Swiss-Prot record, chains A, C:
Superkingdom of the source species: Eukaryota
Similarity-based family: Belongs to the DOCK family.
Induction: Isoform 4: Highly induced by IL4 in B splenocytes, but not T splenocytes.
Domain text: The DOCKER domain may mediate some GEF activity.
Domain DOCKER: from-to ranges: 13-433
Species whose genome carries this gene: Mus musculus
Further details from the record: 'Zizim' means 'spike' in Hebrew.
UniProt-annotated location(s): Nucleus; Cytoplasm; Cell projection, Dendritic spine
Protein name per its UniProtKB record: Dedicator of cytokinesis protein 10
Role, per record: Guanine nucleotide-exchange factor (GEF) that activates CDC42 and RAC1 by exchanging bound GDP for free GTP. Essential for dendritic spine morphogenesis in Purkinje cells and in hippocampal neurons, via a CDC42-mediated pathway. Sustains B-cell lymphopoiesis in secondary lymphoid tissues and regulates FCER2/CD23 expression.
Deletion consequences: Knockout mice are viable and fertile. They show decreased numbers of B-cells in spleen, both follicular B-cells and marginal zone B-cells, and in peripheral blood, but not in bone marrow. Their percentage of splenic CD8(+) T-cells is decreased comparing to wild types.
Tissue occurrence: Expressed in brain, lung, spleen, mesenteric lymph nodes (MLN) and thymus. Expressed by B and T splenocytes. In brain, expressed by Purkinje cells during postnatal development and hippocampal neurons.
From Swiss-Prot, chain D:
Catalytic activity: GTP + H2O = GDP + phosphate + H(+)
Localization of this protein: Cell membrane; Cytoplasm, Cytoskeleton, Microtubule organizing center, Centrosome; Cytoplasm, Cytoskeleton, Spindle; Midbody
Domain of life: Eukaryota
InterPro entries cross-referenced by the UniProt entry: Cdc42 (IPR037874), P-loop_NTPase (IPR027417), Small_GTP-bd (IPR005225), Small_GTPase (IPR001806), Small_GTPase_Rho (IPR003578)
Name under which the protein is recorded: Cell division control protein 42 homolog
Job of this protein: Plasma membrane-associated small GTPase which cycles between an active GTP-bound and an inactive GDP-bound state. In active state binds to a variety of effector proteins to regulate cellular responses. Involved in epithelial cell polarization processes. Regulates the bipolar attachment of spindle microtubules to kinetochores before chromosome congression in metaphase. Regulates cell migration. In neurons, plays a role in the extension and maintenance of the formation of filopodia, thin and actin-rich surface projections.
Similarity remark: Belongs to the small GTPase superfamily. Rho family. CDC42 subfamily.
PTM sites of type (Microbial infection) O-AMP-tyrosine: 32
Native species: Homo sapiens
The keyword GTP-binding belongs to this UniProt entry's keyword annotation: yes
A Gene Ontology molecular function term of the record: GTPase activity
Keywords assigned by UniProt, alphabetized: Cell membrane, Cell projection, Cytoplasm, Cytoskeleton, Differentiation, Disease variant, Glycoprotein, GTP-binding, Hydrolase, Intellectual disability, Lipoprotein, Membrane, Methylation, Neurogenesis, Nucleotide-binding, Phosphoprotein, Prenylation
Species lineage: Eukaryota, Metazoa, Chordata, Craniata, Vertebrata
Keyword flag DNA damage: no
Modified residues (Phosphotyrosine): 64
């Protein structure tokens, strides 16, 4: 029970002590990780052990990893932790093999060449050519795998969640701390929140632990002192446009990440939900203390910032997102018909929700236009144009895919789209395709 | 890189749209950013292998009566929805929804789904329910019905407590595959 | 005719001109090497082209091989010549693939890894995992080969020969020049000397060209002006004791070598040959102007030195060599009897040559001993002790291997060895096992 | 490396020792560095495969007749030599060596190896040979004897002019399997 406090307990133990305890405890953390399935945190453990041994050996004057821990800086910048404090070279390598075994089991294949690079150099010096060839073949199989699965739906690296604990005389170490929890991937909010509640409730008693579903910043003054609280919120990794440029692959999107983001709805009326003219949205970027992957699967959030989006900014955003997603769905080589029809019908024929023309009416009308900042309406006018574009492009795409038991569905999608054009015009007074 | 068509049907206030929004954006019901668009999509892992389950939200009003069944062909799986604290949505399951879907799609499997199971224990709900001589719908009654109308099975869930949530869509996909 | 002058012509052309001409000619050189079977010299040409292009791009500001020609110093130090000056990275890389084709064909497997390393880094940046996988598999396969063949006779890098030309109005740019010729594998003195004679004789007329078989230093004044001369002499690569430690493998024994050695016999009596008490031998180390392998297969000798060994040093040398060689033969995991009996019987049962006890007679008897320097006799005594030692160790080793088809041969070896002990004793006045 | 035991037999002043020192040390006869050990171990490449050919040398005077029998066993091939400019040594192949080696190991193959072919042309040799009324040996009459004596081939060579030197040893090591 509570494998998460166990890791942190062992980890807190690996400081204020000797090199060998630090090692001993990282190894222990690793066997907990392994058996809990957090295979990347077992690999990050072995790689920290490795850099520990390297650093200790360098400092003892025993001599690539003769550099120190910087040898491993490209696996992860967390490794700089090892720079503060009867080993030998064959032990160092054996730890690096543990790492490689677990990069393999954690499907973070792209690091196998880098963790192997120093080992090759040890075996260059001893002219052990057969072991060199094994090392090279291994790296080869490693990129073979990467080539097989990279940038596809096969590899599942994790789903991330903010978790924050609040209860004065309940939590003891995590009290007031806010964390990011890296969960085995495709883990749902339902799974993690219910798992946390059952853990801490076995700790404090059945109905003394409350889930906080609101995602606003918790002020403790408003907390019923009679309970322990756990705020749980889905977050995804956050990147600036520059960063999004610099990371090509899915693995690259999950490697060395310390920033996460989540969106909270609210209305200027101070409520949580409302119509498109007053419903706003806040975007909050949490920053951890250490990048993922790390030797533990939860990392404290040390800082935070947020920005707020206008009703019209909420619309500029979601329409841009919608144009892109439909374009993208129509560039693809072998277009998935059901997903196509799903997103198309959900744009041109909505019957449960307001519809794109709700934004068109609220923000693009001449009177309501006077209300909002001008160049923002101009932006949304263009975006709405491009939107009609992508909708027509998809409506044509799908006509090819039809198996003729869906014709009348397709006329009706088309006819609804033509009405949507008519209205969009009368709001903007343009020919609109 | 595949996709599964699931059509959702039922009355409107039974919180079915809240089920799909909450599950497919991993947010609690009080926290989703509302969207002007219909039709949600979710990746689900099952038996170790991902799928893209696509959820076509139908409106349950008696106006889209002529246009709703244009959304029916190419369906792999159906979810008929009712609230367990709403006995009219239950009889409407028997009288309109399962008759319609099986008339258009006799061979397509469907699943009875109860929602709002958290209110079944909510005192104020049971009080407004009892005052009209009504009781909520119990599990054993919902399951006796799923058997009698030949649904694949009955699944129930709570979008607000998340209990049973994942399983509704996992059993949906399981229904879709065979 | 004469692929050797053609290369030197193309190479001489490669100065006073532009980068692209230097390239054109090295490429031409390479296809002559390629087509003549000198696959290592084809590879050193492609590597010089690579270093040219790298260097030229560096100077032009086009940006690991951005360093320059130093990028390639680990293939060969000759590459430093390219540092004295429409390309791009993909042309550079393909030159490095040509290189790799010919390292493979030249069985210099141990360098393929070095040449692939920059190429791997190009494909790290373009996330090209299939090419990474190919590259790693290639280096793997290359060390597999090295493991199969390193330190064995399955890989034949070349036999070297001094060739020196002398004829006043016959040779033109080679007149008086001295060369090292790197000849394809196992080429014998008989083969190389006959091809040179037929080449230059087609050049100057059938019976106008003479081979100088003597290996002493030719003084030209002593040459009949009516002929052109070609002195041809087998040489092996020469190494210092430090170096001999530092080169493990046969390839390391053939990689980046500029020093060669050959032994000339002579007697105090002014002859070439004589009895063991008067036979000396001069040891000559020629030094080239460029390391082998190079863009050509022949290189000028720019300097030379020699030291001379007296008869007692000739004996110290040759006896030490057989003791070590017989040891090396009895340490080996798999002793092959035929090589054993050959070297053993060739010590204890000589029927053609003088025999070891001739050194014992000339240098160790008390009268003949006083003539020579003390510490040399004292050394030669110990070495000869060890010689009887190694002889007995070999006779016992060989007793296990006999299949009794030649049982009595082992007896006769014993009787001859025991006679040798008795005499060695009466000569040294020691019992000698 | 699989090792081959080859054995060489014939007269002494014929210059077979010269041919051998010439091939295993890569040297012109003039430049051979004399050694007090016997037998030479040479590395040869044939059919693209390297083998080490061990050469057990035996001088030819009648005195040694009794001790020589001992080094014969497991010999893959023998090399039986004469000199073309020494006729008296041509006979000794018929009268002494071939019957001997054949008598010990009948099935094991061998060559007849003509040496000092450089000398056959020289006028000094052939004139001072005609004083004794003998002519030098042509490879015709020697190949007549090859096809007479159950000889695997007659091969000839010159250690002085380097002619046919490689061919002799290649022909040996290949005739050893």
């Amino acid at each position: 029970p509570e494998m998460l406090v166990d890791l942190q307990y062992s980890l807190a133990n690996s400081y204020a002590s000797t090199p060998e305890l630090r090692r001993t405890w990282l190894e222990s953390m690793a066997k907990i990780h392994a058996r809990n399935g957090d295979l990347s945190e077992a690999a990050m453990c072995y790689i920290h052990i490795a850099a520990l041994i390297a650093e200790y050996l360098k400092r003892k004057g025993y001599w690539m990893f003769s550099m120190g821990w910087p040898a491993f800086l490209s696996i992860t910048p967390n490794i700089k932790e090892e720079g503060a404090m009867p080993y030998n070279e064959n032990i160092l390598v054996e730890q690096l093999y543990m790492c490689v075994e677990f990069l393999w089991k954690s499907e973070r294949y792209e690091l196998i060449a880098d963790v192997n690079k120093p080992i090759i150099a040890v075996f260059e010096k001893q002219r052990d050519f057969k072991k060199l060839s094994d090392l090279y073949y291994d790296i080869h199989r490693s990129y073979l795998k990467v080539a097989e699965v990279v940038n596809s739906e096969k590899r599942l690296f994790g789903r991330y969640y903010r978790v924050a604990f609040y209860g004065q005389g309940f939590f003891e170490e995590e009290e007031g701390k806010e964390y990011i929890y890296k969960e085995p991937k495709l883990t749902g909010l339902s799974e993690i929140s219910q798992r946390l509640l059952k853990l801490y409730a076995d700790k404090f008693g059945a109905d003394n632990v409350k889930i906080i579903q609101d995602s606003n910043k918790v002020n403790p003054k408003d907390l019923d002192p009679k309970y322990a609280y756990i705020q749980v919120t889905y977050v995804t990794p956050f990147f600036e446009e520059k960063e999004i440029e610099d990371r090509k692959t899915d693995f690259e999107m999950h490697h060395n990440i310390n920033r996460f983001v989540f969106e909270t709805p609210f209305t200027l009326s101070g409520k949580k939900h409302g119509g498109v003219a007053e419903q706003c949205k806040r975007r909050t970027v949490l920053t951890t203390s250490h990048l993922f992957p790390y030797v533990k699967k939860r990392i404290q959030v040390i800082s935070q910032s947020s920005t707020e989006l206008n009703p019209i900014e909420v619309a500029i955003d979601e329409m841009s997102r919608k144009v892109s997603e439909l374009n993208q769905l129509c560039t693809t080589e072998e277009v998935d018909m059901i997903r196509l029809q799903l997103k198309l019908q959900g744009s041109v024929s909505v019957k449960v929700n307001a519809g794109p023309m709700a934004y068109a009416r609220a923000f693009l009308e001449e009177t309501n236009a006077k209300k909002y900042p001008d160049n923002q309406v101009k932006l949304l006018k263009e975006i709405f144009r491009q939107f009609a574009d992508a909708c027509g492009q998809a409506l044509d795409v799908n006509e090819r895919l039809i198996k003729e038991d869906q014709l009348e569905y397709q006329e009706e999608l088309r006819s609804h789209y033509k009405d949507m054009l008519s209205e969009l015009s009368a709001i903007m007074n343009e020919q609109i395709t | 890189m595949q996709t599964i068509k699931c059509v959702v049907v039922g009355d409107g206030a039974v919180g079915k749209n809240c089920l799909l929004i909450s599950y497919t954006t991993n947010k609690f019901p009080s926290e989703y950013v509302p969207t002007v668009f219909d039709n949600y999509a979710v990746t689900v892992m099952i038996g170790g292998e991902p799928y893209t389950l696509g959820l076509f939200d139908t409106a349950g009003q008696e106006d889209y009566d002529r246009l709703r069944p244009l959304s029916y062909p190419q369906t792999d799986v159906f979810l008929v929805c009712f609230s367990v604290v709403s006995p009219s949505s239950f009889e409407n399951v028997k009288e309109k929804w399962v008759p319609e879907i099986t008339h258009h799609c006799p061979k397509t499997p469907f699943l009875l789904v109860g929602t709002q199971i958290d209110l079944r224990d909510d005192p104020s709900t049971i009080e407004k329910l009892a005052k009209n001589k009504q009781k909520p719908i119990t599990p054993e009654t919902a399951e006796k019905l799923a058997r009698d109308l030949k649904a694949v099975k009955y699944v129930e869930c709570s979008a607000l407590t998340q209990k049973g949530l994942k399983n509704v869509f996992d059993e949906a996909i399981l229904a879709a595959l065979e």
